[PDB]
Amino acid sequence: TERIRNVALRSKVCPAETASELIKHGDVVGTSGFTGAGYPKEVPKALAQRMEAAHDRGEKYQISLITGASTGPQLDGELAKANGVYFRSPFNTDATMRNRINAGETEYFDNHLGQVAGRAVQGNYGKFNIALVEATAITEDGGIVPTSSVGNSQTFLNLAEKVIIEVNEWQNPMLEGIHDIWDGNVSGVPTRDIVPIVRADQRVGGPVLRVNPDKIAAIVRTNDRDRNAPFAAPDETAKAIAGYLLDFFGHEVKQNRLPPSLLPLQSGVGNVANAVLEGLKEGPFENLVGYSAVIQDGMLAMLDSGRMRIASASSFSLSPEAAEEINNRMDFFRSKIILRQQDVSNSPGIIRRLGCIAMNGMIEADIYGNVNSTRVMGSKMMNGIGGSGDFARSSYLSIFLSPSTAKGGKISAIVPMAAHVDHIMQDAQIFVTEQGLADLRGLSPVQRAREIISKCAHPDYRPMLQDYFDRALKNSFGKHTPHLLTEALSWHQRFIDTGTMLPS
Amino acid sequence: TERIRNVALRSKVCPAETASELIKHGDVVGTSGFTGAGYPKEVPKALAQRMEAAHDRGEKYQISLITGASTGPQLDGELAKANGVYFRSPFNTDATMRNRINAGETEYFDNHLGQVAGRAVQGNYGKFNIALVEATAITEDGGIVPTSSVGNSQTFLNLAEKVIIEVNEWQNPMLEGIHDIWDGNVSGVPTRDIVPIVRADQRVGGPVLRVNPDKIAAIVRTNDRDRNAPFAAPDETAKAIAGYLLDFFGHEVKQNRLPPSLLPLQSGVGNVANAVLEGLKEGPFENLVGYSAVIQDGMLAMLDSGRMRIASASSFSLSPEAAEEINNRMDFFRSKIILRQQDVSNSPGIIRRLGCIAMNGMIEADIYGNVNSTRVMGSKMMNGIGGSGDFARSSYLSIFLSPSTAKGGKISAIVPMAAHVDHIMQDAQIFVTEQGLADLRGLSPVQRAREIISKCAHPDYRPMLQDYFDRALKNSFGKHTPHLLTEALSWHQRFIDTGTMLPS
Numbered sequence A, B: 001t002e003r004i005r006n007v008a009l010r011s012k013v014c015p016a017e018t019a020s021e022l023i024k025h026g027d028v029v030g031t032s033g034f035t036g037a038g039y040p041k042e043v044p045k046a047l048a049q050r051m052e053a054a055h056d057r058g059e060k061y062q063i064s065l066i067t068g069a070s071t072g073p074q075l076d077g078e079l080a081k082a083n084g085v086y087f088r089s090p091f092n093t094d095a096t097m098r099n100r101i102n103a104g105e106t107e108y109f110d111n112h113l114g115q116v117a118g119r120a121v122q123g124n125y126g127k128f129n130i131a132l133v134e135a136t137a138i139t140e141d142g143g144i145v146p147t148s149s150v151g152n153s154q155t156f157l158n159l160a161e162k163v164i165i166e167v168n169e170w171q172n173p174m175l176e177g178i179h180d181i182w183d184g185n186v187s188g189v190p191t192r193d194i195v196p197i198v199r200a201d202q203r204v205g206g207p208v209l210r211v212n213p214d215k216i217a218a219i220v221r222t223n224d225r226d227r228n229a230p231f232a233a234p235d236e237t238a239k240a241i242a243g244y245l246l247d248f249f250g251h252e253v254k255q256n257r258l259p260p261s262l263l264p265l266q267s268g269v270g271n272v273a274n275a276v277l278e279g280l281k282e283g284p285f286e287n288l289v290g291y292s293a294v295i296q297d298g299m300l301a302m303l304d305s306g307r308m309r310i311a312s313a314s315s316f317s318l319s320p321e322a323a324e325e326i327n328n329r330m331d332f333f334r335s336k337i338i339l340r341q342q343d344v345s346n347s348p349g350i351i352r353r354l355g356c357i358a359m360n361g362m363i364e365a366d367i368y369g370n371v372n373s374t375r376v377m378g379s380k381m382m383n384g385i386g387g388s389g390d391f392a393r394s395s396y397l398s399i400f401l402s403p404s405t406a407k408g409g410k411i412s413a414i415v416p417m418a419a420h421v422d423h424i425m426q427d428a429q430i431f432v433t434e435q436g437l438a439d440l441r442g443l444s445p446v447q448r449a450r451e452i453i454s455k456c457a458h459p460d461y462r463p464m465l466q467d468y469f470d471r472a473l474k475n476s477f478g479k480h481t482p483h484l485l486t487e488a489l490s491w492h493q494r495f496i497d498t499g500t501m502l503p504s
């Protein structure tokens, strides 16, 4: 049945390839798409091809690409291969785009996800020339129904001089109604409105994105899927991590420091956080509620088992099989899910009010519990800070999760000093690895070190960390946060030099 | 005349030494006190004497000292001299206490100022045995009128098993009415209340701290002043920084990116930020509004002139000259100042909603614009993060201010890598030194470096910085945030070893 239910707009429909021609070299382009969900697919390809052709002719042809968060092969992948992006923000997971960024070929800045809208309205990315937005359907009165995410779409629509919509047969029409778009000033000119959310499951807006139909210069019909990586089935490492955390939650509850149903749950991107949710789907906490940035396979599983009643996020970010699953059971899941603008899902004011429990993965932490979420060896981008800072700093409890080692044991995820810092000590209270859990609340840096080294570090690396700390305590310039600057980053350099942090 | 207007409570009046006997070895003590204002004076002096006497006898006697923020010689000073503090939080500026912390004799954790009350309520500091609070007066119905700051006093009163009040006749009685204390759930158990502040001058509460009279174990009559080091007159360096910043504001206004009256201003503790205020009091912007953690001399000047209409803060941290000037004309300033609980003055939800401009000092930034506010050489505490994180991350614009060098040119305030990080790149958009102003909005790390190096670094260090960056670009593991791990911290080590960052 017709997805474009507004007759007047049908006159604007055209091939993906024609739409792409609206985008000019130098253009700032805002797109839908949040962590592998709901990004535009067909127009990006056409632009990519046109870009390569122009480049061979010696014609400059690159855009600035601002999104909700990560997209997919069809967008980041295609444009990266074409060398078509001079600037990218705020979050990426595509290997080709990542390579461009790590080669200095595409400039990249990973803003806090909840701040992107406000900075765009402030003009930090320049003037938006194009909004390219994927839709489930266009309503009779011209509402744009989003797809598997909301992201920054409403903001990009407001800002852009011209709008291109992609309407996607693949997205299940029962998506219509799952979204909550608030028409208030969240990220506009101060003073901003109060967003009156006081419960994680509370709706305060409507089902559609609003745009002046006059700004719509093109509409493209599509039938393509959100392409995400599957999640790793929880192995012994992941299960141990879940085990420690569930016990921790259990002891908090027994001590009356958490309610039996805990607090609204945020769970970050990646395999480790996902694995913890798989643990929760059969855990001893009932009537859970999610207030997250993304809903991964594990969270969907919790909704499925009924251990979680409802989940708020800006997107569901699912494996191919789970995305197939939810599209086949959209009737069941649509009442369990609320998709919000990312500046609302990731609003520090709301997160703190609700008392969210934040659970996020990490590259590494140093012995003082500073956290790197992003930059391997301090210089090589993995994905980006994403919403981890939005949640870590605002949450009732901030929890970081990681195997105690990486690359088959050749890297320690607990190091003397993080090569890059995304989350300072103040923003991290709990660390969990397969070795144990460190509870850092109320502790000084030296006290944090003792907990982190003794609980979380891998036995292959523990003595070396203890050695570093003991000698730092003796020799450091100051003793408040003891360091030996000649060797603080030496494990990372050892890896670079030899392929392993383990000495020979 | 009579400061204690509740007759019944008069019976609890006693000498300072006697009150101090209520405080026992191991106790967790919460005190009033924020940026050298409104901290208890006589009871801490008495306590310190008794602590030293005990120690002289091989008897242990130490407390955990939790405050609003920094105190003064009578509290931090005396107790540090006595070696009477085993744990301290969240912010200190006393030189003797700083030494205890940096020698490892006092355990320290500098929590974000806006979060301290909530973490106290969560129980991160343990059970509060004692709340010790300075008061201007006690009202007919037993309300406690705070003095020159509010800080965390209401939370501490709520949590503490016993309460001791110091009624200080030095504090002007017309301070009564200047405070705004909310009974709302700001920092308590989730779900918390919406704090409905939508303008900087808005009152939402009442004039007094509330406490069960049955918890009050002692009242001490005092007469002693807040002690706060004077601000030196702005030197040429500080004047240059203010100049660059004011030019920047003027340009934002002419581009319509700020209103002519700017936005609510937050100005951080320290000489540099205060020097900027001094420039604004004689600049082109009128109808200014303060929404800050603290009101320093510069800000008080503008309220005087009528340049600033109102200033919201948790405390006024004035010089002796300024302290007397306001205690004197309290009738006037009384109507231009609102003093709030620090969990409200420093609430990220409100700071964001109001769109504050944050202006803070810093120790150093690296070429990529990560900021160190706290730890010299990464290990030696200066003061603490304070509210700089609260404001930097939540602000409409986050600006950091510093001389381009430190210690007579022997340290570069722009370094290859910051030895410790308090504010990540995402939390800092504008840097200002006497060398110029770097506007980083919308830039990748490599672009940030080009601006910071060229605009902010001192000419004596810029070639060294460019050389580091150039070789990093060629040799770094990744090129997204290029580093040479072999030398990243080598300037700091050079200072440690030779007293200068310049190569010999």
Ligand SMILES: CC(C)(COP(=O)(O)OP(=O)(O)OC[C@H]1O[C@@H](n2cnc3c(N)ncnc32)[C@H](O)[C@@H]1OP(=O)(O)O)[C@@H](O)C(=O)NCCC(=O)NCCS
Pocket (backbone or CB within 6 Å): A267, A268, A269, A270, A271, A272, A273, A293, A294, A360, A361, A362, A363, A364, A373, A374, A376, A382, A383, A384, A385, A386, A387, A388, A403, A405, A406, A407, A411, A412, A413
């Ligand atoms: C940090 C993060 C990459 C961890 O992801 P994860 O899937 O849970 O952890 P994994 O152990 O499976 O590792 C993922 C990759 O990072 C690498 N990695 C993890 N720790 C590493 C370390 N200490 N050193 C080097 N690489 C590391 C792994 O090798 C793996 O790389 P690969 O894909 O090339 O094989 C991921 O959580 C992330 O990008 N976080 C930032 C955004 C965020 O946290 N958002 C929260 C709100 S949605």
Ligand SMILES: CC(C)(COP(=O)(O)OP(=O)(O)OC[C@H]1O[C@@H](n2cnc3c(N)ncnc32)[C@H](O)[C@@H]1OP(=O)(O)O)[C@@H](O)C(=O)NCCC(=O)NCCS
Pocket (backbone or CB within 6 Å): B267, B268, B269, B270, B271, B272, B273, B293, B294, B360, B361, B362, B363, B364, B373, B374, B376, B382, B383, B384, B385, B386, B387, B388, B391, B403, B405, B406, B407, B411, B412, B413
């Ligand atoms: C960072 C901070 C110390 C700077 O203070 P300032 O008065 O503006 O700057 P100054 O240049 O006068 O220097 C202050 C001290 O820091 C030292 N300092 C500053 N930069 C330094 C550097 N790069 N290396 C070593 N020391 C440095 C100075 O030497 C001076 O120390 P001294 O008293 O022993 O001589 C101060 O802003 C602060 O403590 N910030 C943290 C809390 C905060 O910002 N709160 C904001 C909300 S209220």
Ligand SMILES: [Cl-]
Pocket (backbone or CB within 6 Å): A193, A194, A195, A196, A349, A350, B349
């Ligand atoms: Cl809000």
Ligand SMILES: [Cl-]
Pocket (backbone or CB within 6 Å): A440, A441, A442, A443, B111, B119, B124
């Ligand atoms: Cl804590």
Ligand SMILES: [Cl-]
Pocket (backbone or CB within 6 Å): A349, A353, B193, B194, B195, B196, B349, B350
């Ligand atoms: Cl609020």
Ligand SMILES: [Cl-]
Pocket (backbone or CB within 6 Å): A111, A119, A124, B440, B441, B442, B443
């Ligand atoms: Cl930006």
